[PDB]
Design an enzyme around this catalytic site. Structure first.
Site, mmCIF file in Angstrom:
data_model
loop_
_atom_site.group_PDB
_atom_site.id
_atom_site.type_symbol
_atom_site.label_atom_id
_atom_site.label_comp_id
_atom_site.label_asym_id
_atom_site.label_seq_id
_atom_site.Cartn_x
_atom_site.Cartn_y
_atom_site.Cartn_z
ATOM 1 N N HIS A 68 -9.763 1.206 -8.486
ATOM 2 C CA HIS A 68 -8.650 1.744 -9.295
ATOM 3 C C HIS A 68 -9.143 2.801 -10.271
ATOM 4 O O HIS A 68 -8.941 2.675 -11.470
ATOM 5 C CB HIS A 68 -7.927 0.611 -9.991
ATOM 6 C CG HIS A 68 -6.998 -0.118 -9.087
ATOM 7 N ND1 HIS A 68 -7.310 -1.326 -8.585
ATOM 8 C CD2 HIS A 68 -5.782 0.211 -8.581
ATOM 9 C CE1 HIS A 68 -6.313 -1.762 -7.834
ATOM 10 N NE2 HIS A 68 -5.345 -0.850 -7.826
ATOM 11 N N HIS A 72 -9.003 7.278 -6.614
ATOM 12 C CA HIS A 72 -7.729 6.660 -6.166
ATOM 13 C C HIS A 72 -6.553 7.537 -6.614
ATOM 14 O O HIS A 72 -5.646 7.782 -5.821
ATOM 15 C CB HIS A 72 -7.573 5.252 -6.698
ATOM 16 C CG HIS A 72 -6.261 4.623 -6.385
ATOM 17 N ND1 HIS A 72 -5.848 4.395 -5.108
ATOM 18 C CD2 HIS A 72 -5.299 4.122 -7.181
ATOM 19 C CE1 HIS A 72 -4.660 3.814 -5.137
ATOM 20 N NE2 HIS A 72 -4.313 3.629 -6.383
ATOM 21 N N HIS A 106 -0.576 7.124 -11.954
ATOM 22 C CA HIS A 106 0.121 5.850 -11.667
ATOM 23 C C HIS A 106 -0.753 4.655 -12.051
ATOM 24 O O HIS A 106 -0.200 3.550 -12.152
ATOM 25 C CB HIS A 106 0.639 5.768 -10.242
ATOM 26 C CG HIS A 106 -0.403 5.375 -9.261
ATOM 27 N ND1 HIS A 106 -1.341 6.260 -8.841
ATOM 28 C CD2 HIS A 106 -0.676 4.188 -8.663
ATOM 29 C CE1 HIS A 106 -2.179 5.612 -8.004
ATOM 30 N NE2 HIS A 106 -1.789 4.345 -7.869
ATOM 31 N N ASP A 107 -2.054 4.824 -12.232
ATOM 32 C CA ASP A 107 -2.965 3.665 -12.480
ATOM 33 C C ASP A 107 -3.814 3.948 -13.735
ATOM 34 O O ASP A 107 -4.874 3.337 -13.915
ATOM 35 C CB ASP A 107 -3.821 3.359 -11.261
ATOM 36 C CG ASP A 107 -3.234 2.358 -10.273
ATOM 37 O OD1 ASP A 107 -2.403 1.522 -10.679
ATOM 38 O OD2 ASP A 107 -3.631 2.402 -9.082
ATOM 39 N N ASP A 217 0.407 4.901 -2.486
ATOM 40 C CA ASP A 217 -0.500 3.943 -3.142
ATOM 41 C C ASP A 217 -1.329 3.227 -2.089
ATOM 42 O O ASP A 217 -2.444 2.881 -2.394
ATOM 43 C CB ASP A 217 0.271 2.939 -3.987
ATOM 44 C CG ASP A 217 -0.608 2.280 -5.020
ATOM 45 O OD1 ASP A 217 -1.680 2.858 -5.348
ATOM 46 O OD2 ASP A 217 -0.223 1.207 -5.472
ATOM 47 N N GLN A 269 -7.064 -8.828 6.142
ATOM 48 C CA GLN A 269 -6.672 -7.440 6.474
ATOM 49 C C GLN A 269 -5.497 -7.500 7.441
ATOM 50 O O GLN A 269 -4.470 -6.797 7.145
ATOM 51 C CB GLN A 269 -7.901 -6.630 6.938
ATOM 52 C CG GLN A 269 -8.920 -6.335 5.820
ATOM 53 C CD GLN A 269 -8.232 -5.534 4.741
ATOM 54 O OE1 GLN A 269 -7.807 -4.398 4.962
ATOM 55 N NE2 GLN A 269 -7.965 -6.170 3.609
HETATM 56 C C1 LIG Z 1 -3.694 -10.717 1.961
HETATM 57 N N1 LIG Z 1 -5.130 -10.889 2.078
HETATM 58 C C2 LIG Z 1 -5.835 -12.045 2.164
HETATM 59 C C3 LIG Z 1 -7.181 -11.696 2.235
HETATM 60 C C4 LIG Z 1 -8.393 -12.601 2.383
HETATM 61 C C5 LIG Z 1 -8.238 -13.964 2.450
HETATM 62 C C6 LIG Z 1 -9.361 -14.782 2.578
HETATM 63 C C7 LIG Z 1 -10.636 -14.231 2.635
HETATM 64 C C8 LIG Z 1 -10.804 -12.865 2.585
HETATM 65 C C9 LIG Z 1 -9.663 -12.054 2.470
HETATM 66 N N2 LIG Z 1 -7.270 -10.349 2.177
HETATM 67 C C10 LIG Z 1 -6.014 -9.852 2.065
HETATM 68 C C11 LIG Z 1 -5.668 -8.382 1.934
HETATM 69 C C12 LIG Z 1 -6.510 -7.802 0.825
HETATM 70 C C13 LIG Z 1 -5.960 -6.445 0.432
HETATM 71 C C14 LIG Z 1 -5.059 -6.290 -0.712
HETATM 72 C C15 LIG Z 1 -4.561 -4.989 -1.117
HETATM 73 C C16 LIG Z 1 -4.982 -3.855 -0.319
HETATM 74 N N3 LIG Z 1 -4.691 -2.528 -0.427
HETATM 75 C C17 LIG Z 1 -5.348 -1.905 0.625
HETATM 76 C C18 LIG Z 1 -5.339 -0.412 0.875
HETATM 77 C C19 LIG Z 1 -4.276 0.253 0.109
HETATM 78 C C20 LIG Z 1 -5.698 0.407 -0.301
HETATM 79 C C21 LIG Z 1 -6.081 -2.854 1.376
HETATM 80 C C22 LIG Z 1 -6.925 -2.549 2.556
HETATM 81 O O1 LIG Z 1 -6.408 -3.186 3.664
HETATM 82 N N4 LIG Z 1 -5.865 -4.062 0.809
HETATM 83 N N5 LIG Z 1 -6.345 -5.303 1.184
HETATM 84 MG MG LIG Z 2 -1.366 0.198 -9.718
HETATM 85 ZN ZN LIG Z 3 -2.673 2.501 -7.217
#
Ligand SMILES: Cn1cc(-c2ccccc2)nc1C#Cc1ccc2nc(C3CC3)c(CO)n2n1
Ligand SMILES: [Mg+2]
Ligand SMILES: [Zn+2]
EC number: 3.1.4.17
Length: 313
Positions: A68, A72, A106-107, A217, A269
């Protein structure tokens, strides 16, 4: 006034595409932003002296957290730039002005922690702002920098144009609160499908600008696989630091934030692409058809995460 910003040829061409990466040279990011304002808005939109001073103050108020951060901010503005250039005629002179600035800001002053961690820590900001805690803070920091002397990039606007542009920016920044995205997209789904979506309705525009903000974002999932993958390391480095901090308050973090549960990253992911990204870019492409490349690139990265799970990398 007769002073253009230009970019080396590879950047001049690649910056127009959705999947452009702004590179590792921090000192070129202001120039890239100004370049994008000039082509998206005009060289007449902002007093150059004031813009450069506003850009540098904004930069100074981003912190050196893994994700962040100032990179970004410029990445999210570039995605907004691509959306605005591929949909020339749909947006006001004010919208084009406000939205690139909203994205850069925004951040502002993000600390690398979720709204949830602020609330469980009992951070003063969670008493001042009970919902969208960091996002109300980011808008607050935007207004502060705009009120510094020599920093009012909007000084030439009428009293009421000024008010409309700060109101576009406020709603645009609030909408980056992902808790708000889910309902905002469900409504946009229904309005598009029942045929009621109307872009002259101001409350409809708002929702659509909201969805574009979520799309910009999240744009790191719309890049070439090696960019997407290396960004995921920064994203998880904040989340795991946040999990550490949860444990320090005596609270098992969710697995997303538990560095002990690294092994389950590929499946997380998948959830994220299926529950958040794909639906976002689907509904966005429905409403604004020339944004399809974002959907196509997101789907390609979903399929790269599927490959990771199958041990094909
Ligand atoms: C829902 N979830 C559960 C787990 C998890 C569970 C157990 C062990 C390890 C991981 N990981 C996620 C996901 C995370 C996550 C959150 C926001 C985000 N923004 C972006 C891009 C916009 C920049 C990405 C990239 O894809 N992300 N990724
Ligand atoms: Mg934000
Ligand atoms: Zn952001």
């Amino acid at each position: 006034g007769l002073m253009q910003f230009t970019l080396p040829v590879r950047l001049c061409k690649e910056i127009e595409l959705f999947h452009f990466d702004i590179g590792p040279f921090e000192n070129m990011w202001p120039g890239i932003f100004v370049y994008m304002v000039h082509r998206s808005c005009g060289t007449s939109c902002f007093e150059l002296e004031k813009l450069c001073r506003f850009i540098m103050s904004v930069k100074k108020n981003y912190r050196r957290v893994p994700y962040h951060n100032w990179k970004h901010a410029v990445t999210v503005a570039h995605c907004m730039y691509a959306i605005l250039q591929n949909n020339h005629t749909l947006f006001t002179d004010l919208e084009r002005k406000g939205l690139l600035i909203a994205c850069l800001c925004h951040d502002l002053d993000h600390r690398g922690f979720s709204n949830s961690y602020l609330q469980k820590f009992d951070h003063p900001l969670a008493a001042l702002y009970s919902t969208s805690t960091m996002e109300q803070h980011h808008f607050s920091q935007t207004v502060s920098i705009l009120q510094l002397e020599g920093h009012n990039i909007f000084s030439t606007l009428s009293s009421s144009e000024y008010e409309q542009v700060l109101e576009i920016i406020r709603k645009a920044i609030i909408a980056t609160d992902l808790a708000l995205y889910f309902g905002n997209r469900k409504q946009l789904e229904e309005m598009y499908q029942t045929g009621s979506l109307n872009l002259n309705n101001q409350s409809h525009r708002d929702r659509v600008i909201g969805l574009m903000m979520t799309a910009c974002d999240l744009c790191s999932v719309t890049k070439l696989w090696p960019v997407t993958k290396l960004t995921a390391n920064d994203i998880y480095a904040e989340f795991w630091a946040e999990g550490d901090e949860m444990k320090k308050l005596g609270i098992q973090p969710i697995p997303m934030m538990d560095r002990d549960k690294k092994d389950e990253v590929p499946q997380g992911q998948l959830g994220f692409y299926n529950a958040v990204a794909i639906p976002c870019y689907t509904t966005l492409t429905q409403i604004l058809p020339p944004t399809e490349p974002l959907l196509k690139a997101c789907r390609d990265n979903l399929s790269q995460w599927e490959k990771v799970i199958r041990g094909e990398e």
